[PDB]
Amino acid sequence: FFDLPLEELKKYRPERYEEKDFDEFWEETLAESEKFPLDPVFERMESHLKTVEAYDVTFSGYRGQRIKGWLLVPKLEEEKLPCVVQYIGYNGGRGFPHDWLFWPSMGYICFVMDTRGQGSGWLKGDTPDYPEGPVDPQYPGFMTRGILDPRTYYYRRVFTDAVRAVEAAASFPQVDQERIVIAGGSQGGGIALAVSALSKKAKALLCDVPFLCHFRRAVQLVDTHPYAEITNFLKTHRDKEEIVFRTLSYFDGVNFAARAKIPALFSVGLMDNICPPSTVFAAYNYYAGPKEIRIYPYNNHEGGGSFQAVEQVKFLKKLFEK
Amino acid sequence: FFDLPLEELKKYRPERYEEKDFDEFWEETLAESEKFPLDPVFERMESHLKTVEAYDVTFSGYRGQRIKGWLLVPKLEEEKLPCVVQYIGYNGGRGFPHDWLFWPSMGYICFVMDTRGQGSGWLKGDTPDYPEGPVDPQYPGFMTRGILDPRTYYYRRVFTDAVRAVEAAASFPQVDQERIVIAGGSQGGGIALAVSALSKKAKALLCDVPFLCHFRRAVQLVDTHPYAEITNFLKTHRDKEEIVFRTLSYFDGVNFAARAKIPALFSVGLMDNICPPSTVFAAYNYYAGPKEIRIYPYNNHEGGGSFQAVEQVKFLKKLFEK
Amino acid sequence: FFDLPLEELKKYRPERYEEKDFDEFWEETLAESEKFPLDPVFERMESHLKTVEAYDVTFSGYRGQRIKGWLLVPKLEEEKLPCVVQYIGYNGGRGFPHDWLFWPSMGYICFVMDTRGQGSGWLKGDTPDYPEGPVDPQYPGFMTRGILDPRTYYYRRVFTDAVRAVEAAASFPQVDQERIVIAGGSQGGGIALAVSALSKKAKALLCDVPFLCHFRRAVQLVDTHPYAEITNFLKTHRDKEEIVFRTLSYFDGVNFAARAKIPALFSVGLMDNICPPSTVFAAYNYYAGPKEIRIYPYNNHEGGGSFQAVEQVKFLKKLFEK
Amino acid sequence: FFDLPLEELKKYRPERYEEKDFDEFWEETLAESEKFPLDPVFERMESHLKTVEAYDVTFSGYRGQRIKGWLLVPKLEEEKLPCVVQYIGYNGGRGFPHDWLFWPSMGYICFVMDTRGQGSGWLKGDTPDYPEGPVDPQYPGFMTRGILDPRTYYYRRVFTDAVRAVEAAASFPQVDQERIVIAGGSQGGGIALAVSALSKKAKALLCDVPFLCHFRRAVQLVDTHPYAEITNFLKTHRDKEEIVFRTLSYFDGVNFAARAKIPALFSVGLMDNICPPSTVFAAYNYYAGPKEIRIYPYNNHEGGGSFQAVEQVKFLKKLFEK
Amino acid sequence: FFDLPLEELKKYRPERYEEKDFDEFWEETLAESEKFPLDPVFERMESHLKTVEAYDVTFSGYRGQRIKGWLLVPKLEEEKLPCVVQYIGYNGGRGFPHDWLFWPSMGYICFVMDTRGQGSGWLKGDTPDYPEGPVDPQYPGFMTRGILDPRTYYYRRVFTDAVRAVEAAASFPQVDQERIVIAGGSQGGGIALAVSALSKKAKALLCDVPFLCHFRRAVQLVDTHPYAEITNFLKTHRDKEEIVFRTLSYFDGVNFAARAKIPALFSVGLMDNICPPSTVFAAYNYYAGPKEIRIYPYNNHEGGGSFQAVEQVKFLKKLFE
Amino acid sequence: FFDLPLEELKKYRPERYEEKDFDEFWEETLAESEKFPLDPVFERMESHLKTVEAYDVTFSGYRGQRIKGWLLVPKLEEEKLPCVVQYIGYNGGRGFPHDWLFWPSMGYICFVMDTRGQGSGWLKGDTPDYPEGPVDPQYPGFMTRGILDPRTYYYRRVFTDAVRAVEAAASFPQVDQERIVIAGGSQGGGIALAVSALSKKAKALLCDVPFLCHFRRAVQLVDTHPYAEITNFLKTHRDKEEIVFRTLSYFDGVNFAARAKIPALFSVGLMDNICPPSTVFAAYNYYAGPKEIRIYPYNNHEGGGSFQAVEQVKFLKKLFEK
Ligand SMILES: [Ca+2]
Ligand SMILES: [Ca+2]
Ligand SMILES: [Ca+2]
Ligand SMILES: [Ca+2]
Ligand SMILES: [Ca+2]
Ligand SMILES: [Ca+2]
Ligand SMILES: [Ca+2]
Ligand SMILES: [Ca+2]
Ligand SMILES: [Cl-]
Ligand SMILES: [Cl-]
Ligand SMILES: [Cl-]
Ligand SMILES: [Cl-]
Ligand SMILES: [Cl-]
Ligand SMILES: [Cl-]
């Protein structure tokens, strides 16, 4: 227990920092990318999978750039199925179709979005990043890539891809548009949180041990990666503090949370030193839609693990009967 | 690369140490346990799973003691399905049914054996250990529990459970007895290795980064857990070296390997410092059945990860067409 | 200094948690063990020791189970001598008679109680544990062994052994029953603290850097072993929090301290990260008999070392003239 | 001393691996970049420096891309001065002009080349990278950026910049073109080694504890950064080993060493676990020009530090009289 | 961020602890060492340096003991130059003349004082320590050497050397006595702070991430070296706490700060776990001369690095107008 | 197992390096210190000890310098008792009389020599060092204090004290001069080894996990303290290697072993990374007296612990009947 006590976490609502053009920045970003056709493509693949049909996905994300993914459809009688759009943790990528059997086995179509330029840490990826011309001086990793200007910042592109991933999922014929869920843990959680504010198609949010929240506090509290990439950039570029946090404010899950309206299930580990509880609760507490949080007092970044998976299935079942 | 060079690993066949009553010890152990009825129980669960039927399993292992498990049956047309009996890594247990969706998704019935007394490190378990009266002085963990005599040693009970697990799998009506696979990684690999020598019902072996192999070398090469448990016991009980290694000779994967006849797919990570390559290759090189090994030169204990899973599915498909 | 400041530690009295049947549970436990005869046996040994007479000890602890120990009697004229009953730290055991020369050299008979099932970490032991039938899923070690029910919990048996050890010591003819001291550091301290509440024969308590105190707080403050064994168990068995802490409440030093009446000398190290200062002071502050504490502000788990030994001799000398 | 003994290091000449088109790739790379004008720009700075004039440098490196640097010209009577082209270690950048006072103080003009896209670890930088369209999946850092094809690989661009840096230095009117030295430690040493083979203008090489050498061995020997970035990429992309090492063969200091003709002073620390001695000696031993090496047996990656600085000044003084 | 929040650091003025004979102890220490003649010697070196003239220095510090140093003089037309007296961090020594090119390059003469008995960790040294007869039981290092009595304590001799270093620098003919700066980081900073109180010749102080401050707090907040040397000594010698802290009170930068009058530029890293911010601010906040501090919130012990070097050049230029 | 295999350790006899004046250096050193009177003073202490009489010792060691110690005389009828002269490990000191109760309890007088200038790491000391005028530049600790000249080196003074300790012990009336044993572990072991060569009064050697042996190899094999102090000194003073090892040659246990004639019991831990096995075996294999070694294959620097204590008592008992 290195963070605020739980009684204080439950009330923690730090003063939010955002620029006055926060919304306009996102409106312009999405409008510019909507000018390119989504051109979603689903290509059935040869697989040893027997209970699921697997498709190679391609769609246009940020600025028409082609993003890969998987679509896993469980072999069931129902003509329309509910659907989970799944975002991936830091240094991960879409891997193989059989890496994502959980939701299909629970009777949900699952759209897994590959993460541009990552896919080399713990699971392979196939989607490149495409920068806005020059790739500035940065610290190793993604956290500081383009960080001196929100228009060039890496997560501008990722978030836009993620919003478009929902539209691509929605274009698949047996996807029930009334039951599209956006889901992620860690980086995936932070991507999902941004999507829960920017997407018009998402109906529910699953958001575990979210990353990309309350940056200024994160960097103060922990010296773990990936948040430490920002700290290390700041150690060297000592004249850039104000600029760095200005940029980051446009991508902070706390600011997106204040705008999200769809129902949400959060989870948090009180001993999580990768995504500290105070950063997660800051997001949760500002989250503007109907919400619940599962608190795992003795867990680190693993969170509630399989226990939380059970909670997520129960939560959605109940949500989509009401 | 801390271990022997790959060219030497491929030829590494250290002199084996075993007592003259190795086989008789195992014959008696099995014969005594076979006097208790197996009494396999399969109970269908209420589950949110939609593509798989899940059953709560109970069967009689070592000395009639009741061992838990899961049976996952994928919802397919075929009357008889092939079957994977899955053993679990150190500190793990059967967890939830949805923790084992891989093989069922590939059209295999999957029998997951819970590990007696463990289930508290990374995945919950539900089966206790039942010792042979007194529980001798030991180092924390399972590696030294009862280690001063093979009759009292922990893995005598686990291995017997494991052989009985194959019988329990085989009792299920939808299981094709010609395609029963025994499978495990790490501790699971070592269990499966023992079962490949002791079971009459097993048709194929999947054995990843196996643990419980070449104890004397393991303990001299690495200071990682769980092999360090043995080392720390020896640090204190300095008068017990000979007895400890005598006991471990009855449970060493290399000695079982020299007796196994069924086809096997092994995997090994050359930078694995939990199960060092020399111990894995010792087991592989002595393995007496038709065999292949996948070598992952840059991997630590994670081995081939999902790459190896692809290899396993390809390997069994080809095997069961011949 | 990671824990509360000294001024706050001196007043720290957190709300105690215990079940209504605390006392009854212990009354029954001891009554049930008293139905077996103590049958204490003292067997003089061949030894190179010249200033001390060494005896192999055996006595009946929990439920008649046979516990080992040593009795060390200094060669002195006096026909009745004072006596220290010594309990042992985690992963320790009775070792050799020459591992316990301090108190005999100070003119005290010393009864060293071996610890059931341990003796494999830093000093050898010879006493097994005997469990209550099934040995449940647990994390490696003794902290979580039987932890889902106070009737099955490991320390129920250790504490009962320890109460019976004082009776065994008292049965030795040369022991002055008016000057029997119970003593321990770390785990030994926690055991001695339990004995100070449950024994009728103990006349003074020496309690250094005690372990088994204020579990809830211990587990939140430090990630060191052995308290981390509980945290790790909780990380996995996420549905078992309330049951775990309910069990531990019956064995908590704080709850025993509130019942102990005999005079006591405690010690604490303010930088001790194995047994945190707040857990030790919680115990000391609730301790209901006449008491003193020696505070070592710069020491970690070693506490006052040999300096504290000097204080203990001086404390008992003065106590037993008064 | 974790590497080969010194007697063996002195003889270590592993078999070299390079593609048949090695020279051809470099010839085309340079020829394509030479079609863009160098357009060197030196702009005198307002500075508090009093013994040295400082210039802001800009020149065209790889494919006309604008690279920053500093030029430090010590205030001396001589019309033409000798000149050191300085390359910078991993995660470093050109920093401030006063970060490079050594060579000017010794009477050499110093040209410090900023490193594209780095400058965020231990010294700031101002020069971006400009990738060849898509920036593929990569591990955090620069070592795997574009690694699936030598045409897209990061170091192709760095090396081309570095060759052009020497031409930009040569264009400064006060530079004696007969006494242009190329210099670097670690990454800088590796860049310098490449330039010693590719540049026609360099007259001498200073190469300390070089990085970018004998990749295959580096990655097998040490788990330190930055070589571990390659290992980690390999751990995930298990199907990409052959391609990765193919690509890296075009950038390996050992293969450049075999082609360099200018005189060289190397240094090596025998306890260096960032740049292992065997990788350094492999480069040194294949180095085809007149050469010397200073061996620091007890030093890790810091090498000879200031002692080596003295050696370099003596080395060049003697070289440029002789 | 392990220490007090920045808002509390800016107000942190812990009650100071010093003995009533603090000043007399220092007055006597200096008076006794002033009885030996400074006898400064500057010996021109053969060097490959071309823009600087380098001299081997020797002068008499504590009790006439001969301390080594370097004097680096930039080759400039001006007949009088300003001067920086540079003190060295823990386990360092005077090294080579080319290890100190910064200030000379900025037009300042630079006097680098070698540190008695150290010079074996990250940069070579050539000056021995000469102890007061017996070298008491101590923990490895310099922090507890002679710690049981201020008169025998290692830093008494280092501080005395340091004060005399300024007199040595001042004796060089080109040195402008009106523009003598004392400078250090870490251990150097702590030495410089001491000299700022004890020297009559120093005109300005540069003090980065200073060490030797607020010992009682230092030892309770971090377990890093070198403060952990004291903690470890105390772990063993458990009967010696009061004596140890009494001795350290005579060498604590916070007590010297309360006495310094010369203008000062401080720097601090808020993530510094070698010299914790609360110890640095304690010294800055009690500092009695005109003062500024540069705060680097995201830096550990490296502080402002080259950024701070820029600040220091700007600060002095403005000060000496 | 990081060091040479056991079969090679048993034959390891590396070429010895020593100066031609080795013997003369020691002859002179001892002759000069013998010109001061030993002036041994035993002063009976008030103690709580009841089975042992404790004396405060003071004697003249190196150059008449006054060294403290303890003398512990067990209360026995015998008029003459055998005697153990005990030397202390690095950063230790004489501590309290009750810190050394083992040998008196076994019926031996025990003379504990305090270590000049240490006494501040793990046990308090009371004896200063008194250097030969100037205390040269050094790395923190004792290993490099005065290292640039054998005449100023710290261990010259310690070894001379240690030889004088035996004379001091001999002067006590109840000491049987025919049964004086010199004993130490680690630093104590290296001191004892020196004394076994230099003392004329010593009758047997107990030498555990000895330190101060085969320095050149120690420093190349391990990075642990205290050997690492030398390595660090060398990292900075890069021009001093030859001098440093010249000096250390006069203090190397291997060179003393080659001269010792008294019977000796050694011990060694094969996983000891503070005093590596190859250094210990080098000393043991060159040891010129009758000898035995107890090998503890699985132990670290703790060696045989209490088991070795048993061995030492049995060894001496047998030796002093023969
Ligand atoms: Ca707006
Ligand atoms: Ca496709
Ligand atoms: Ca047989
Ligand atoms: Ca009650
Ligand atoms: Ca017996
Ligand atoms: Ca060619
Ligand atoms: Ca006064
Ligand atoms: Ca001779
Ligand atoms: Cl993540
Ligand atoms: Cl495992
Ligand atoms: Cl304990
Ligand atoms: Cl580098
Ligand atoms: Cl420092
Ligand atoms: Cl030692």
Which residues have C-beta within 8 Å of that of residue A107, sequence separation ≥ 6?
Answer: A74, A76, A78, A81, A82, B48, B50, B51
Q: Which residues of F71-106 are buried (b: 16+ CB within 10 A; e: fewer)?
A: bbbbebeeeebbbbbbbbbbbbbbbbbbbbbbbbbb
CB-CB contact of C247 with C147 (8 Å): yes
Nearest to A203 by CA among A148, A261, A157: A261
Q: What angle do CA A11, A12, A14 make, to 5 degrees?
A: 140
E296 vs A239: CB contact, 8 Å cut-off?
A: no
C44 bridge partner residues:
C55
Please tell me the distance from the alpha carbon of residue B52 to that of residue E109, in angstroms, as a whole number: 82
Nearest to D147 by CA among D237, D66, D209: D237
User: E72 CA to chain D: closest CA distance, Å?
Assistant: 11
Q: Between the CA atoms of E214, E217, E218 and E223, what dihedral angle is there, to the nearest 10 degrees? A: 170
Please tell me the distance from the alpha carbon of residue A190 to that of residue A174, in angstroms, as a whole number: 28
Nearest to F230 by CA among F239, E195, F220: F220
The amino acid that residue E161 corresponds to is D
**CA B214 to chain CA mean position, Å:** 15
**Token couple for A13:** 């609502």
C-alpha gyration radius of chain E: 19
Greatest extent of chain A over all pairs of C-alpha atoms, in Å: 61
Class of residue A171 by CB neighbours under 10 A (exposed 0-12, middle 13-18, buried 19+): middle
Nearest to B42 by CA among B64, B63, B57, B23: B57
Please tell me the distance from the alpha carbon of residue A220 to that of residue A227, in angstroms, as a whole number: 10
User: The sheet that has F41-44: what strands, in order across it?
Assistant: F41-44, F52-60, F66-74, F109-113, F81-86, F175-185, F204-208, F264-269, F291-296
- What single-letter DSSP state applies at residue B302? T
Helix (H, G, I), strand (E, B) or coil at F184: strand
CA distances C287 to C179, C290, D203, Å, are: 20, 8, 82
**Token couple for E42:** 């500057």
Query: What is the CB neighbour count within 10 angstroms for residue D211?
Result: 26
The dihedral region occupied by B209, where left means phi > 0, alpha psi between -120 and 50, and beta the remainder, is left
Q: Between the CA atoms of F301, F304, F309 and F313, what dihedral angle is there, to the nearest 10 degrees? A: -120
H/E segment holding residue A68: strand A66-74
Which residues have C-beta within 8 Å of that of residue F46, sequence separation ≥ 6?
Answer: none
The amino acid that residue B150 corresponds to is P
Nearest to D113 by CA among D131, D126, D130, D98: D126
Q: Which chain B positions have a beta carbon within 8 Å of C144's beta carbon?
A: 120
Class of residue A133 by CB neighbours under 10 A (exposed 0-12, middle 13-18, buried 19+): exposed
Q: Which chain F positions have a beta carbon within 8 Å of B221's beta carbon?
A: 1
E81-86 vs E175-185, strand pairing mode: parallel
Nearest to E311 by CA among E257, E266, E278: E266
The amino acid that residue F284 corresponds to is Y
CB-CB contact of F157 with F146 (8 Å): no
F and A touch per CB criterion (3+ pairs under 8 A): no
Nearest Cβ partner for B123 among C136, C233, C236: C236
Class of residue B132 by CB neighbours under 10 A (exposed 0-12, middle 13-18, buried 19+): middle
B204-208 vs B175-185, strand pairing mode: parallel
User: A217 CA to chain D: closest CA distance, Å?
Assistant: 21
Query: What is the CB neighbour count within 10 angstroms for residue C227?
Result: 25
The amino acid that residue E237 corresponds to is H
D and F touch per CB criterion (3+ pairs under 8 A): yes
Q: What angle do CA F57, F63, F66 make, to 5 degrees?
A: 20
Nearest to D1 by CA among D307, D309, D296: D296
CB-CB contact of C125 with C93 (8 Å): yes
Q: What angle do CA C29, C35, C41 make, to 5 degrees?
A: 105
> What is E222-272 written as a DSSP string?
---TTTHHHHHHHHH-TT-HHHHHHHHHTT-HHHHHTT--S-EEEEEETT-
3-state helix, strand, coil in chain D (%, to 5): 35, 20, 45
Query: What is the CB neighbour count within 10 angstroms for residue B95?
Result: 22
Please tell me the distance from the alpha carbon of residue D225 to that of residue C243, in angstroms, as a whole number: 45
Please tell me the distance from the alpha carbon of residue C262 to that of residue C181, in angstroms, as a whole number: 10
Residue C131 has φ and ψ, to the nearest 5°, of: -80, 160
D208 bridge partner residues:
D185, D267
Residue appearing with tokens 């079609």 = D35
Ordered domains of chain D (ranges, CATH): 1-322 (3.40.50.1820)
Class of residue E254 by CB neighbours under 10 A (exposed 0-12, middle 13-18, buried 19+): buried
Neighbours of chain C (3+ CB pairs under 8 A): A, B, E, F
> What sections of chain A are H helices per DSSP?
6-9, 22-34, 102-105, 154-171, 187-198, 215-221, 227-236, 241-249, 253-257, 277-286, 305-319
Residue appearing with tokens 């503070």 = F274
Please tell me the distance from the alpha carbon of residue F257 to that of residue F127, in angstroms, as a whole number: 28
Residue A181 has φ and ψ, to the nearest 5°, of: -115, 135
CB-CB contact of B42 with B70 (8 Å): no
H/E segment holding residue D312: helix D305-319
Any catalytic annotation for residue E98? no
Please tell me the distance from the alpha carbon of residue B68 to that of residue B259, in angstroms, as a whole number: 28
CB-CB contact of B267 with B208 (8 Å): yes
User: The sheet that has D52-60: what strands, in order across it?
Assistant: D41-44, D52-60, D66-74, D109-113, D81-86, D175-185, D204-208, D264-269, D291-296
Q: Is the Cα dihedral F260, F266, F270, F271 positive or negative?
A: negative
Q: By what technique were these coordinates determined?
A: X-ray
E238 vs C296: CB contact, 8 Å cut-off?
A: yes
- What single-letter DSSP state applies at residue C77? S
Please tell me the distance from the alpha carbon of residue C248 to that of residue C242, in angstroms, as a whole number: 10
Q: Between the CA atoms of C21, C27, C33 and C34, what dihedral angle is there, to the nearest 10 degrees? A: -170
CB-CB contact of F93 with F103 (8 Å): no
Query: What is the CB neighbour count within 10 angstroms for residue C85?
Result: 31
Please tell me the distance from the alpha carbon of residue D58 to that of residue D128, in angstroms, as a whole number: 13
Catalytic residues of A: 186, 272, 301
Please tell me the distance from the alpha carbon of residue E274 to that of residue E223, in angstroms, as a whole number: 9
CB-CB contact of C180 with C206 (8 Å): no
Q: How far is the CA of C156 from the centre of ligand 4 (A)?
A: 17
User: What is the stated resolution of the deposited model, in angstroms?
Assistant: 2.5
| Half-sphere exposure of residue F22: CA atoms within 13 angstroms, side-chain side | 20
The one catalytic residue in E3, E60, E161, E186 is E186
> What sections of D3-101 are H helices per DSSP?
6-9, 22-34
Nearest to C280 by CA among C266, C262, C290: C266
Helix (H, G, I), strand (E, B) or coil at E53: strand
CA distances A149 to A245, A247, E126, Å, are: 10, 6, 51
A111 bridge partner residues:
A71, A85
CB-CB contact of F276 with F220 (8 Å): no
Which residues have C-beta within 8 Å of that of residue E135, sequence separation ≥ 6?
Answer: E145, E146, F117, F128, F129, F130, F131, F135
CB-CB contact of C196 with C256 (8 Å): yes
What are the counts of helices (DSSP H) followed by strands (DSSP E) for chain F? 11, 9
**CA E202 to chain CA mean position, Å:** 13
Any catalytic annotation for residue C99? no
Q: How far is the CA of C27 from the centre of ligand 4 (A)?
A: 10
Please tell me the distance from the alpha carbon of residue B311 to that of residue B295, in angstroms, as a whole number: 12
Please tell me the distance from the alpha carbon of residue C150 to that of residue C23, in angstroms, as a whole number: 13
Q: Which residues of A42-70 are buried (b: 16+ CB within 10 A; e: fewer)?
A: beeeebbbbbbbbbbbbbbbbeebebbbb
Q: Which residues of F257-277 are buried (b: 16+ CB within 10 A; e: fewer)?
A: bbbbebbbbbbbbbbbbbbbb
Q: How far is the CA of F94 from the centre of ligand 14 (A)?
A: 14
Query: How many CB pairs lie under 8 A apart between chains E and F?
Result: 92
> What is E95-154 written as a DSSP string?
--GGG--HHHHTT-EEEEEP-TT---SSS-----B--SS-B-S--SSSTTTTTT-TTT-H
Q: How far is the CA of F237 from the centre of ligand 13 (A)?
A: 19
CA distances B91 to A306, A309, B163, C141, D294, Å, are: 16, 21, 20, 12, 52
Please tell me the distance from the alpha carbon of residue A141 to that of residue A144, in angstroms, as a whole number: 7
Nearest to D95 by CA among D114, D81, D76: D114
C54 bridge partner residues:
C72
Strand stretches in D133-193, DSSP E: 175-185
What are the counts of helices (DSSP H) followed by strands (DSSP E) for chain C? 11, 9
**Token couple for F182:** 């010199």
> What is D234-295 written as a DSSP string?
HHH-TT-HHHHHHHHHTT-HHHHHTT--S-EEEEEETT-SSS-HHHHHHHHHH--SSEEEEE
User: E309 CA to chain F: closest CA distance, Å?
Assistant: 26
The amino acid that residue A65 corresponds to is Q
B300 vs D235: CB contact, 8 Å cut-off?
A: yes
F59 bridge partner residues:
F67
Please tell me the distance from the alpha carbon of residue D219 to that of residue D223, in angstroms, as a whole number: 7
Helix (H, G, I), strand (E, B) or coil at F56: strand
> What sections of B20-69 are H helices per DSSP?
22-34
Q: Is position B90 annotated in a ligand binding site?
A: yes
Which residues have C-beta within 8 Å of that of residue A253, sequence separation ≥ 6?
Answer: A189, A190, A193, A194, A210, A212, A213, A214, A283
Catalytic residues of F: 186, 272, 301
Q: Which chain B positions have a beta carbon within 8 Å of F305's beta carbon?
A: 238
CB-CB contact of D111 with D71 (8 Å): yes
CB-CB contact of B74 with B50 (8 Å): no
In total, chain F counts a number of residues equal to 322
H/E segment holding residue C205: strand C204-208
Report the residue of E46, E47, E94, E106 to disrupt the D interface, i.e. the one with the largest count of D CBs within 10 Å: E106
Give the residue ranges of the annotated binding site of D for substrate.
90
Please tell me the distance from the alpha carbon of residue A43 to that of residue F162, in angstroms, as a whole number: 84
